[PDB]
Assembly symmetry: none
Homo-oligomer: 259 residues x 2
DNA sequence: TTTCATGCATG
DNA sequence: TTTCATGCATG
């Protein structure tokens, strides 16, 4: 009915009103390195405070959430302050290229879009699209593993004087997409069995549910949201697509036709 | 029983390693208005002291419970003994810290004054204590500095001081902060199981149920909740669904001890 | 359509 | 196991 009916009836699931997610059934991830890689410490390109504090709030919510924590490893990558053109709208992009080229490489395992969507029968024509905000942060990076992603950052005001590292899957990592998509596939393994009349599509952090009735869809969406909630994930309510007869899933479009 | 081991990985400690409260955020430690960092010198140790104690901190750095640091604070780290040939436990004299730290009204209940409430209707108990409960809670990087302590050693490449990332053992408000938190989270469990009696004294817990049956669902529901919350309890020590159990020094059949 | 770097695939 | 240049995504 109202977006808020869904929002209020399931605050545990939504990212907006429900705290940052964290895959609870998911063990810390180890990041196996290439048979012979060795720590490489790239240096932080001189950064103009004008831009540092322009990106500081970003590091803050992360430092506070414990997703970014102090440390000191022989690894190091540059933090690149990316300013959206024509706006003091700064955001950090870690250049994890070196690290990436020393970390063993995992083969992808992602359902090419098109096909995946093609298998969906005319029977199920009520869709629900959801995208788990901050999907990678939901996955814990094993202890003995975070040193790799360390980037230099000093803030007396935050008890940081050297470098932070991640405790979750950081954007910019190459195996991040295939690892997550897999864990989520593993956490929705049960859910799909629970609902043999629903079709559950997922591309890493993008999910689509299709039912034969708006009701079956609604109920399916509840059981759905609720399963992600307790699991630790968090759906984006602003970009939520709720029991609708037509939706955009993966740059695609879907009720009685196509793109 | 060899079924609880295997049906609840996350609940127990043995099948779910060190815990972590996915619902509680890193804690900032409000310092006393007059407080100012304190540098207490490190009482030198004998190689045997260092030795024994060494592995300890090691397990710690690896697990990320310790981080190098150059803090103005510094507390001594006493080498502790026990009988046999060589057996120590790191103990940091966090006293000088606890004094400058701003304390907090004690939420922790009175041992006995607690069990008292236990209704004779529930003669079915389950007692499962929590393992490394404090480290399930973590420190903000801003509040870590206080807890910093000395350790010059290549073995792990330290020259500086080490500090804590989780509520440390020895801090005046730890028992109050953990109990307060576990209580915080475990709230809904209660509302969801009204006809189930849950007693919690810091990291020790006693679930009470009316019937053996009732007691099972209780324990399951609980273990299930300790998991997804980030709490690991010693399955070893655990006493599941028993008419007679022992909890908080005080034993329980009908009367007690 | 970047307060940077750049591997890639493209002509 | 290349034989130069370069826009454009991605770190």
């Amino acid at each position: 009915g109202s977006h808020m009916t869904w929002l209020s009836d399931f605050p545990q699931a939504w990212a907006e009103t429900g705290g940052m997610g964290l895959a609870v059934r998911q063990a810390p991830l180890i990041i196996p390195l290439k048979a012979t890689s060795t720590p490489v410490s790239i240096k932080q390109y001189p950064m103009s405070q004008e831009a540092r504090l322009g990106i500081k709030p970003h590091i803050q919510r992360l430092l506070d959430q414990g997703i970014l924590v102090p440390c000191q490893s022989p690894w190091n990558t540059p933090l690149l302050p990316v300013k959206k053109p024509g706006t003091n709208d700064y955001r950090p992009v870690q250049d994890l290229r070196e690290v990436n080229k020393r970390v063993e490489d995992i083969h992808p395992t992602v359902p090419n879009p098109y096909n995946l969507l093609s298998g969906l029968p005319p029977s199920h024509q009520w869709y629900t699209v959801l995208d788990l905000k901050d999907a990678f942060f939901c996955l814990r990076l094993h202890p003995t593993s975070q040193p790799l992603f360390a980037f230099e950052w000093r803030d007396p005001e935050m008890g940081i004087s050297g470098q932070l590292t991640w405790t979750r899957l950081p954007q910019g990592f190459k195996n991040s997409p295939t690892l997550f998509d897999e864990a989520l596939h593993r956490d929705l393994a049960d859910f799909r069995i629970q609902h043999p009349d629903l079709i559950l599509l997922q591309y890493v952090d993008d999910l689509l549910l299709a039912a034969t009735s708006e009701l079956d869809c609604q109920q399916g969406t509840r059981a759905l949201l609720q399963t992600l909630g307790n699991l630790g994930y968090r759906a984006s309510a602003k970009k939520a697509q709720i029991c609708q007869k037509q939706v955009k899933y993966l740059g695609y479009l879907l009720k009685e036709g196509q793109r």
